[PDB]
Amino acid sequence: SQTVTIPCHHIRLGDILILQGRPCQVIRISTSAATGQHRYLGVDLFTKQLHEESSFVSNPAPSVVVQTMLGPVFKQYRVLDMQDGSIVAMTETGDVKQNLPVIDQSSLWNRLQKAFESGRGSVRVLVVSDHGREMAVDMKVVH
């Protein structure tokens, strides 16, 4: 309910994966000489520390070999207000989050503020959770 399984051949630099239980932005992908597993080096979205984790290899059916990692399930919240590096957000069911932080990554705050001031009702934030802690890590505009 918190994670989604992603095939390694669909993982690129910049993707967000769960590494050592933490949501992280991938900054390096390499291959283990001994096992053929892929190794992902990432930056923890919350603490900014580096973490690495290698892929899980499975053989679920004859001649089917799968290598996967976990990615987080992103939630999408409406944006009701913006106040000093945090936002007031609303869930799909109307639950209000008063002080939701916004990651300082790829000018997200500035892009969010421009989109919010053009049309407030169509702006959404994509939100990751880390052990009760929520943060807005990207944005979308609904059509």
Residue numbers in the entry: 30 to 172
From the reporting publication:
Here, we present InCellCryst, an advanced pipeline for producing homogeneous microcrystals directly within living insect cells. We have demonstrated the pipeline on five different proteins (IMPDH, HEX-1, Cathepsin B, Luciferase and EGFP-µNS), representing a selection of soluble proteins of different source organisms that crystallize in insect cells in their native compartment or, in case of peroxisomes, readily in the cytoplasm or nucleus of the cells. Importantly, as shown for IMPDH and HEX-1, InCellCryst can produce crystals from native protein sequences, without purification tags or even remnants of proteolytically removed tags, within a quasi-native cellular environment. The rich source of biomolecules in the cellular environment allows the identification of native ligands by co-crystallization at quasi physiological conditions, representing a unique feature of InCellCryst.
The N- and C-terminal addition of single amino acids (cyto) leads to spindle-like crystals in the cytosol. The disruption of the native PTS1 signal by cloning into the pFB1 cyto and cyto v2 vectors transformed the hexagonal crystal blocks into a spindle-like shape. Whereas HEX-1 cyto and cyto v2 both formed spindle-like as well as bipyramidal crystals, HEX-1 ori crystals exhibit a hexagonal block shape. For data collection from intact crystal-containing cells at 100 K, we carefully transferred the cells onto a MicroMesh mounted on a light microscope stage. CrystFEL is optimized for still images in high multiplicity collected at RT at XFEL sources and thus, can be directly applied to serial synchrotron data. All HEX-1 structures show an increased flexibility between Phe145 and Ser151, the C-terminal loop region after the α-helix.
